[PDB]
Symmetry: C2
């Protein structure tokens, strides 16, 4: 399990390098597995959960990586603490869940990855990187995390 | 270890089933235990209307009764939304992934904003139609698939 995880992270970071994606995503290991972190700006508009047209190439490049491994995928949405209460997103829970769902719907309906591999998770603002006391800290909180679970 | 923790889980399920019985809730929810923990199962019609993720006003009494039970334990809570295989494509919910996740979210937003349960206790989970109760071959099987599962995680 320990060597497996270090080999997967190495494989993932190598994919990021070979495809010139360092500015679009970062990879790390924690207790969940190997996690891809994508800041909001490479996927969505502010307060929205529709995958941007220019984001589809990036999600395609990630899908090509995900097709080479068997692991289950957990896609997590995270917001900063700024209030959202629109018709489309009545709270940060719905917005964070809608963003994870939107990514998975892309993976399954356009990239044809099996639905049974995915779980959509919304955290609202409960897992800040640090806090929400500055605009810099709020910005890093607005993110999607693609968790490659241990297999 | 196992015995100390599965016996603890056994007692929690009995506590939940007793709460359901004492408060006359059997027709509105069931409880079980599996590898995730102790799970409350609510069929869609006790929470939402068809294809929507807004908690019905009449569902707020049941959610309060569930919140009272949840306040008596420390466990983390995972709220899962599940659909049947019927396709949905509306403005608010472009797919069953979005619909399932928005339903889990609306439940949590009610618990946190109206019942004062701490936000840190929750995660919203959407499974779309990937986890049917049995299948989607019949109307009764599709109906039971449309549900929310409130998972009381282990400690």
């Amino acid at each position: 399990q320990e060597d497996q995880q270090d080999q997967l992270l190495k494989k993932v970071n190598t994919y990021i390098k070979d495809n010139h994606l360092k500015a679009q995503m970062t990879a790390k290991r924690d207790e969940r597995g190997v996690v891809l972190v994508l800041q909001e700006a490479v996927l969505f508009d502010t307060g929205e959960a529709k995958v941007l047209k220019n984001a589809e190439t990036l999600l395609h490049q990630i899908a090509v990586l995900l097709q080479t491994i068997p692991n289950d995928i957990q896609v997590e949405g995270h917001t900063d603490s700024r209030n959202i209460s629109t018709y489309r997103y009545p709270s940060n829970w719905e917005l964070s869940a809608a963003r994870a769902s939107g990514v998975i719907q892309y993976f399954t309906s356009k990239e044809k990855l099996p639905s049974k591999r995915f779980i959509a998770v919304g955290y609202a603002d409960t897992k800040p990187v640090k806090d929400n006391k500055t605009n810099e800290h709020m910005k890093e909180n607005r993110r999607v995390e693609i968790v490659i679970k241990k297999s």
